[PDB]
Amino acid sequence: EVQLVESGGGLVQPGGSLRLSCVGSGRVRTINTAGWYRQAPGQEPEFLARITVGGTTSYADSVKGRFTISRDLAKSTVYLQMDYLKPEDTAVYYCNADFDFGSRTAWGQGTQVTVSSG
Ligand SMILES: CCOP(=S)(OCC)Oc1ccc2c(C)c(Cl)c(=O)oc2c1
């Protein structure tokens, strides 16, 4: 059993940066990959970034060059560094983790990211 706790959302101006954290607890040794997703109101979730235990990363085209996914195995934490945020990036961001040989999946509770000048 794996649980995911997220943090780091909030308000940010266009062009600003935020870092999201995805802290894993439980049988974290079984986690194979972890990914970042986002969902806007009334839309399907959108894949953003993926990372394996070895550190291999994969990105969606909408965030390449701006977002960086990383993982700290000692802390069981997956990070999403989001640079040059745009109003289009406003959504609730979720992290997932595939564990038990990629046969189980756990989702974080989500964190709201709003890109606005006010
Ligand atoms: C949401 C947290 O995700 P992460 S940092 O994994 C991202 C892919 O979870 C871990 C953390 C530690 C380990 C260790 C020590 C071993 Cl030996 C292993 O096989 O898998 C791990 C997976």
Host H or E run for residue 95: strand 91-99
Yes or no: say if 30 and 2 are a contact pair by the CB < 8 Å rule.
Answer: yes
- Hey, what domains does the chain have and what are their CATH numbers? 2-113 (2.60.40.10)
Ligand 1, CB within 6 Å, residue ranges: 4, 22, 24, 28-29, 31, 33-34, 51-53, 71-73, 76-78, 97
CA distance 99 to 40: 26
38 near 96, Cβ under 8 Å? no
Q: Report the atom number in ligand 1 closest to the C-alpha of 53.
A: 8
Question: What does 16-83 look like in DSSP terms, one character per residue?
Answer: --EEEEEEEEESGGGEEEEEEEEE-TTS--EEEEEEETT--EEE-TTTTTTEEEEEETTTTEEEEEE-
Resolution value, angstrom units: 2.0
The torsion angles phi and psi of 28, rounded to 5 degrees, stand at -70, -25
Q: What is the residue whose two structure tokens read 């802290």?
A: 23
Q: Which atom of ligand 1 is nearest to the CA of 33?
A: 8
Identity of the residue numbered 29: R
- ∠ CA(61), CA(9), CA(106), 5° rounding? 70
